[PDB]
Design an enzyme around this catalytic site. Structure first.
Site, PDB file in Angstrom:
ATOM      1  N   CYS A   1      -4.565   5.358   8.244  1.00  0.00           N
ATOM      2  CA  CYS A   1      -4.313   4.186   7.446  1.00  0.00           C
ATOM      3  C   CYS A   1      -3.469   3.224   8.221  1.00  0.00           C
ATOM      4  CB  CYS A   1      -3.568   4.510   6.152  1.00  0.00           C
ATOM      5  SG  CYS A   1      -3.324   3.048   5.089  1.00  0.00           S
TER       6      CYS A   1
ATOM      7  N   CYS B   1      -4.972  -4.096   3.061  1.00  0.00           N
ATOM      8  CA  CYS B   1      -5.803  -3.163   3.808  1.00  0.00           C
ATOM      9  C   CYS B   1      -5.526  -3.407   5.257  1.00  0.00           C
ATOM     10  CB  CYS B   1      -7.234  -3.533   3.657  1.00  0.00           C
ATOM     11  SG  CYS B   1      -8.402  -2.399   4.408  1.00  0.00           S
ATOM     12  N   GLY B   2      -4.889  -2.475   5.906  1.00  0.00           N
ATOM     13  CA  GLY B   2      -4.592  -2.602   7.339  1.00  0.00           C
ATOM     14  C   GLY B   2      -5.766  -2.859   8.308  1.00  0.00           C
TER      15      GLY B   2
ATOM     16  N   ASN C   1     -15.930  -2.454   3.088  1.00  0.00           N
ATOM     17  CA  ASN C   1     -14.779  -3.201   2.633  1.00  0.00           C
ATOM     18  C   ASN C   1     -15.018  -4.690   2.846  1.00  0.00           C
ATOM     19  OD1 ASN C   1     -12.726  -0.857   2.193  1.00  0.00           O
ATOM     20  ND2 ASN C   1     -13.704  -0.439   4.126  1.00  0.00           N
TER      21      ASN C   1
ATOM     22  N   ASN D   1       0.946  -1.134   0.000  1.00  0.00           N
ATOM     23  CA  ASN D   1       0.000   0.000   0.000  1.00  0.00           C
ATOM     24  C   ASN D   1       0.965   1.158   0.000  1.00  0.00           C
ATOM     25  OD1 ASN D   1      -2.130   1.763   0.622  1.00  0.00           O
ATOM     26  ND2 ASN D   1      -2.696   0.640   2.487  1.00  0.00           N
TER      27      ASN D   1
ATOM     28  N   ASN E   1      -5.591  11.215   0.100  1.00  0.00           N
ATOM     29  CA  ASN E   1      -5.879  10.135  -0.812  1.00  0.00           C
ATOM     30  C   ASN E   1      -5.494  10.604  -2.172  1.00  0.00           C
ATOM     31  OD1 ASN E   1      -7.210   8.327   0.966  1.00  0.00           O
ATOM     32  ND2 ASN E   1      -9.052   9.551   0.877  1.00  0.00           N
TER      33      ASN E   1
ATOM     34  N   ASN F   1     -13.965   2.119  10.165  1.00  0.00           N
ATOM     35  CA  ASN F   1     -14.624   2.074   8.831  1.00  0.00           C
ATOM     36  C   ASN F   1     -15.288   0.703   8.697  1.00  0.00           C
ATOM     37  OD1 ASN F   1     -12.123   0.715   8.687  1.00  0.00           O
ATOM     38  ND2 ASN F   1     -11.488   1.622   6.771  1.00  0.00           N
TER      39      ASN F   1
END
EC number: 5.1.1.7
Lengths: 276, 278
Positions: B83, B221-222, B194, B15, B74, B159
């Protein structure tokens, strides 16, 4: 293990890592290439242009004192065709004082190319490159996404099929949805790059391209020459000057009865150092 | 005009970010500049920009002003909070360049302070641990990826996540699936979600792929890895534990507790240079 200087740039958004190696001290292996051109794990490019004398490139038989565009694809492979790339390599050469003449020759694996720097500074240039005699191979068709297009087959060192589409606006071109095209297998025995093109309009056209086992790209040099041949043919001309708009910019193509040129920009956008 | 900016390119389990040191808060970095820099063919290329600035110089910073703030943008230009992966790279930058003196320290973000621990670091590589908060399992839902229905666990990591642990999924067969944008319950996840598809806990590990909302598949994706590890533990009837999570961009290690979670993983600094914005 080793830190080396590099630059990043592009010629109509076909982007390259330039690695100086005047003294040919770098063993650049295909795994090093693949790492460097990995967009998420590396620096990210369509390829590497390594700056070296022809003398020192295994297998070049061109005049040994030329600078040689030792060009590697992102997968490590030795590129045999070159296009937009040449404009960037010319720009680097001239702007870093490695040649001192606006008109000179470049060794490539496809043979010597001749270029002319038209404007150049440290960051931008316009370069004219001699692209060879386009070899028109005749009408063919292709299918993209359940629709047949007439095209003109063209050999520029690699095969193309350029489909000029009467009626199609620059907008409509923009909105079409592309897919890997199907086409005449026996007409193209090593596969084919396919261009969809609008009709000559003020000496200009717009193009989108599906490259061979790559898919849609921002720009394809040899491809813009193909499109120019076709757009001229689609109008009944065999010679001419055409501005070609691709998603990555604008080039100018000149078709002669005995040759062709490609004129367009180059950009050196960053300079630094990278680790192996 | 154009403008020339010193930068670094890095990544955290692939990433990838552009780091832009701005210690005196001199650079006015606009959304359109961000877009141009993050453009992979016309620019340098990245998932985002990490501007290195004191929290004292960010308006609306909740945190202690003497901290370094991850002014994270972003690739589309929009402002972002935190992030999981990018904090690792930021921590790596701050520590390896001597901007902080301890291996354990706080970083300001738009989601609040984040605590990190440097496990190993030099100029190119590191291993960093980040505290990622208490996961909040929001319920049980399902999705459909390319015709096939998967059951999963709603996780809120800051999120939304639907982590779907799939009994009988091998790593081989995970790598061969064809991912498409999932369909999901719009009432359960009114702001999108997600999606993680995960294998079952085996020898303290799982593999995952992720479709991130509005972005499609990513290499890492962390917050997803932490969701994934929740689901893996819960499918094994455990409420706490340590899980190695394998993503296409590498490996991380998630620790879940009752009172929180951590994510340890790598960081790499790949290049340094200067770039000219058009």
């Amino acid at each position: 293990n080793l830190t080396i200087p590099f630059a990043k740039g592009h010629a109509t958004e076909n982007d390259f890592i330039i690695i100086p190696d005047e003294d040919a001290r770098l063993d650049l292996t295909p795994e090093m290439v693949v790492t460097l051109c990995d967009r998420r794990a590396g620096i990210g490019a369509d390829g590497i242009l390594r700056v070296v004398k022809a003398a020192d490139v295994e297998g070049s038989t061109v005049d040994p004192s030329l600078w040689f565009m030792d060009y590697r694809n992102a997968d490590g492979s030795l590129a045999e065709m070159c296009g937009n790339g040449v404009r960037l390599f010319a720009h680097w050469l001239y702007s870093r004082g490695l040649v001192d003449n606006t008109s000179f020759d470049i060794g490539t694996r496809a043979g010597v190319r001749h270029v002319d720097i038209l404007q150049a500074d440290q960051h931008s240039a316009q370069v004219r490159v001699d692209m060879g005699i386009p070899d028109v191979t005749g009408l063919s068709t292709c299918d993209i996404n359940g629709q047949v297009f007439a095209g003109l087959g063209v050999d520029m060192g690699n095969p193309h099929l350029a489909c000029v589409v009467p009626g199609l606006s620059a907008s409509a071109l923009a909105d079409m949805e592309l897919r890997a095209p199907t086409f005449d297998q026996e007409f193209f025995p090593h596969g084919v790059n396919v261009e969809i093109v609008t009709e000559l309009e003020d000496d200009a056209v717009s193009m989108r391209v599906w490259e061979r086992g790559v898919g849609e790209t921002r720009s394809c040099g040899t491809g813009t020459v193909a499109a120019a041949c076709a757009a001229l043919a689609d109008a009944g001309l065999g010679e001419g000057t055409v501005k070609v708009c691709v998603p990555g910019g604008e080039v100018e193509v000149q078709i002669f009865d005995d040759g062709s040129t490609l004129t367009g920009p180059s950009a050196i956008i960053a300079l630094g150092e990278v680790q192996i």
